[PDB]
Amino acid sequence: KSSGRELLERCARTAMSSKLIHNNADFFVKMCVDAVLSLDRNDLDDKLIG
Amino acid sequence: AKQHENRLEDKDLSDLEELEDDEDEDFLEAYKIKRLNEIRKLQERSKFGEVFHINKPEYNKEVTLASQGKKDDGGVYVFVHLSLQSKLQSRILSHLFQSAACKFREIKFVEIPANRAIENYPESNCPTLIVYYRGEVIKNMITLLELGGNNSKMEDFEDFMVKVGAVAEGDNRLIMNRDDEESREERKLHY
Amino acid sequence: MGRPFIIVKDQGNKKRQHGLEAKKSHILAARSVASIIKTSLGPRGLDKILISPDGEITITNDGATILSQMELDNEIAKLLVQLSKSQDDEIGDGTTGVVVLASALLDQALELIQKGIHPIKIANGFDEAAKLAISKLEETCDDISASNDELFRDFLLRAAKTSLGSKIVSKDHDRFAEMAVEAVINVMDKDRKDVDFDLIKMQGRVGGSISDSKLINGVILDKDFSHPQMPKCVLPKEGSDGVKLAILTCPFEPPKPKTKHKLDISSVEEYQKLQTYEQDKFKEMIDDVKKAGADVVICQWGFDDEANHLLLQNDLPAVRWVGGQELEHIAISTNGRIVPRFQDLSKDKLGTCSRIYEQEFGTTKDRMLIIEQSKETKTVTCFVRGSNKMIVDEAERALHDSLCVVRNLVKDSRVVYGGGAAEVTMSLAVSEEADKQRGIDQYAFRGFAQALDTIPMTLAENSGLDPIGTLSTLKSKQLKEKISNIGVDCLGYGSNDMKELFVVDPFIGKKQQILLATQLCRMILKIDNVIISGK
Numbered sequence: 001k002s003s004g005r006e007l008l009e010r011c012a013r014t015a016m017s018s019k020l021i022h023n024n025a026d027f028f029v030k031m032c033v034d035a036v037l038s039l040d041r042n043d044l045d046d047k048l049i050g
Numbered sequence: 051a052k053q054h055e056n057r058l059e060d061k062d063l064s065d066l067e068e069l070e071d072d073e074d075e076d077f078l079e080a081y082k083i084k085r086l087n088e089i090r091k092l093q094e095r096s097k098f099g100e101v102f103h104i105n106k107p108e109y110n111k112e113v114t115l116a117s118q119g120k121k122d123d124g125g126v127y128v129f130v131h132l133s134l135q136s137k138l139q140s141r142i143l144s145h146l147f148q149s150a151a152c153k154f155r156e157i158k159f160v161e162i163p164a165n166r167a168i169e170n171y172p173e174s175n176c177p178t179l180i181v182y183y184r185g186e187v188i189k190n191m192i193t194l195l196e197l198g199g200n201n202s203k204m205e206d207f208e209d210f211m212v213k214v215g216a217v218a219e220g221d222n223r224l225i226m227n228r229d230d231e232e233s234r235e236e237r238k239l240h241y
Numbered sequence: 242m243g244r245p246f247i248i249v250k251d252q253g254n255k256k257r258q259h260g261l262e263a264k265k266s267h268i269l270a271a272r273s274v275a276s277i278i279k280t281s282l283g284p285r286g287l288d289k290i291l292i293s294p295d296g297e298i299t300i301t302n303d304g305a306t307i308l309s310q311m312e313l314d315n316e317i318a319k320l321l322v323q324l325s326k327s328q329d330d331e332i333g334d335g336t337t338g339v340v341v342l343a344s345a346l347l348d349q350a351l352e353l354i355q356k357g358i359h360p361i362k363i364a365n366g367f368d369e370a371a372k373l374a375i376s377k378l379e380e381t382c383d384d385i386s387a388s389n390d391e392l393f394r395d396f397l398l399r400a401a402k403t404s405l406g407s408k409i410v411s412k413d414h415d416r417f418a419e420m421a422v423e424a425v426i427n428v429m430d431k432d433r434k435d436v437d438f439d440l441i442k443m444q445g446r447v448g449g450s451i452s453d454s455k456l457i458n459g460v461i462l463d464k465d466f467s468h469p470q471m472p473k474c475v476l477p478k479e480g481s482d483g484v485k486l487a488i489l490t491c492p493f494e495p496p497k498p499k500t501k502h503k504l505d506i507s508s509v510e511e512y513q514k515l516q517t518y519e520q521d522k523f524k525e526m527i528d529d530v531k532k533a534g535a536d537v538v539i540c541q542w543g544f545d546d547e548a549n550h551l552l553l554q555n556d557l558p559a560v561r562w563v564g565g566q567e568l569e570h571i572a573i574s575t576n577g578r579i580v581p582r583f584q585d586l587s588k589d590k591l592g593t594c595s596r597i598y599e600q601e602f603g604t605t606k607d608r609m610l611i612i613e614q615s616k617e618t619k620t621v622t623c624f625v626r627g628s629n630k631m632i633v634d635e636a637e638r639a640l641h642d643s644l645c646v647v648r649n650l651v652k653d654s655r656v657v658y659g660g661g662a663a664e665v666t667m668s669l670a671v672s673e674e675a676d677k678q679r680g681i682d683q684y685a686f687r688g689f690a691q692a693l694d695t696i697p698m699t700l701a702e703n704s705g706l707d708p709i710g711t712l713s714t715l716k717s718k719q720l721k722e723k724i725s726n727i728g729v730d731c732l733g734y735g736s737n738d739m740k741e742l743f744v745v746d747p748f749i750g751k752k753q754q755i756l757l758a759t760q761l762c763r764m765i766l767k768i769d770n771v772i773i774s775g776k
């Protein structure tokens with residue numbers, strides 16, 4: 001019964017390894033987590049993230 | 051080898067009917083359907099047929115957008131004429147545009163005054179002929195001394211259109227290939 | 242297996258590199274690019290000559306302009322081309338410093354690559370050192386927003402003279418710095434200020450000397466009047482001092498539609514009727530303009546001939562063929578708006594100008610109009626001169642760099658004091674924290690410290706002073722005293738305190754030197770395989 005917001009931040013932290021972001025991941029992980037949450041859960045689209 | 055190709059290549063849809071009684075139907079009608087489809091494409095491409103007397107704001111569209119056409123790279127040739135009524139060669143070139151416009155309906159024929167075209171253009175350099183195609187200038191032609199000058203004829207203008215890739219060499223509309231009916235009549239009698 | 246062994250096309254031209262030796266060429270390749278622009282840093286710099294393939298020549302010292310339009314082969318130098326450019330587009334200053342600072346991080350990082358530390362772990366040390374360096378600079382940063390507009394007016398000169406001092410424009414730094422400051426006074430809103438950079442135009446004419454350059458308020462045109470018999474200088478009369486400048490999109494021509502059309506002309510009755518149609522059109526045309534009361538009319542396209550004379554009769558000059566992009570800028574300064582058509586022309590949409598004159602330039606057959614405004618208007622246009630084509634381009638670029646430096650002061654009033662003072666201040670901050678946080682990344686903090694020291698040592702090298710006495714004095718003095726505005730005096734003054742020398746730099750400009758450098762070098766260090774397909 002954990003929170004849903006912290007789930008996306010926890011799993012996205014693994015993706016930001018092996019890149020130029022891993023030290024700046026504290027600020028940019030909030031961007032993609034808040035970005036995808038604005039999308040509709042039923043209809044998640046890949047072209048709206050240009 | 052060429053004797054077999056001349057039966058189909060050197061005959062239009064009107065001339066292919068000569069071989070209806072001699073040659074096989076399946077050999078002839080297979081090519082007539084091909085040539086009939088090519089005739090239909092030229093009719094759809096016949097978007098022009100008279101000189102478009104334009105003005106500048108429009109140049110930025112008529113001359114160039116057209117040159118893109120469909121943009122299937124459906125390019126369109128656009129012959130521009132920077133006219134100058136004081137010059138004698140300009141009025142000659144204006145007559146060639148209207149004559150060629152009635153024949154070649156797929157090619158766009160554009161005319162505009164030279165004083166309105168370019169800021170402070172040299173009057174000595176007029177008349178000027180520009181040829182656009184897909185937005186690019188294919189030929190920036192100078193006054194008609196290359197094309198005979200004052201003695202320019204319709205045959206010389208049609209030959210220039212073949213050089214820039216606007217009209218095919220073996221086109222039946224060109225005066226070089228469009229032999230008179232009396233000429234072909236004498237050939238059949240003397241054959 | 243056969244003798245052919247192919248996986249990808251064109252294996253002969255494609256060649257890989259790997260190992261420690263492959264990375265060694267990358268940092269040493271940056272030294273060749275850095276060493277070229279190392280002498281051009283500071284006020285004692287020297288320009289570089291550029292030659293294009295088309296034969297056009299230009300001279301400059303800006304690092305982005307040097308590296309731009311240059312034929313390159315290695316990929317790492319092309320990243321430095323995009324670097325300097327980065328700082329230029331956003332900031333417009335520090336293009337040589339970010340490349341030298343980026344090369345300094347790479348030079349200090351090679352020693353460490355030689356010991357057995359992984360390259361990504363080295364970049365992690367610079368990130369903690371860079372955030373601690375900028376955080377410490379923010380702590381000792383002074384703000385000038387509390388002062389009034391009078392004292393704040395002076396601070397723009399202290400920073401405008403800094404960037405103009407490192408160019409060839411510095412023969413009169415007091416004179417030309419007012420040009421860069423007075424242009425921004427006319428666009429600032431005086432509260433939650435925005436620069437509105439697009440209004441500020443910039444054009445320079447090749448002619449005369451640079452001392453004759455004077456700032457104007459208007460628009461510079463590179464074209465003549467419709468007829469040369471018109472008067473050159475046009476003044477207003479008894480009332481309505483604004484000249485009522487009418488701006489037009491459609492020129493003086495016959496009306497006709499865009500689509501193809503043929504007007505069927507009947508027998509002689511219709512032929513004589515159409516002669517009265519256009520003759521009454523021009524009479525309706527000139528009555529419409531005189532009803533509006535305009536004194537100057539400009540169209541983007543040329544008027545007809547008959548039309549050029551009809552305007553000349555009523556004392557109504559006209560300019561013709563004004564560029565479409567240039568037409569919009571005239572309406573903003575004159576506090577007007579462009580009419581779509583002539584039927585909507587009225588008094589409210591006309592312009593306002595103090596005076597205009599047709600300026601001659603020697604024996605050349607060209608004409609330039611110079612619009613001037615007595616009161617503070619919206620836009621402003623620079624008027625640069627010089628005795629060469631490239632020196633005007635250099636003055637335009639030197640003024641453009643100063644125009645972007647003062648642009649940062651408007652959006653961000655928090656400034657710093659560079660010239661070796663910020664570098665030595667940020668170098669000892671990470672050094673004092675290195676021995677507290679030994680760990681394994683202490684060598685990365687020391688490499689970041691020594692990398693920052695290359696900038697004031699470069700200024701000491703170009704100025705001729707001893708780097709030993711200069712570096713030892715700054716390290717010993719700044720460790721003793723807390724005042725952090727002492728740096729390398731390059732002009733040879735007796736005092737190194739920069740309060741009296743009138744030098745100021747922005748915080749956003751000096752910050753981007755460290756950020757774009759430390760973020761690039763992470764990418765440079767992470768390359769292992771290097772494949773270059775030969776052209």
Ligand SMILES: Nc1ncnc2c1ncn2[C@@H]1O[C@H](COP(=O)(O)OP(=O)(O)O)[C@@H](O)[C@H]1O
Pocket residue numbers: 281282283284302303304334335336337338403404406407659660661729730731732742744746
């Ligand atoms: N008169 C001066 N006194 C002290 N320091 C100066 C003086 N002029 C320039 N500097 C310093 O030298 C540096 C030179 O920067 P500059 O070369 O103009 O930018 P870029 O390196 O992008 O071309 C500035 O950051 C400034 O700190």
Ligand SMILES: [Mg+2]
Pocket residue numbers: 334335404407642
């Ligand atoms: Mg500078």
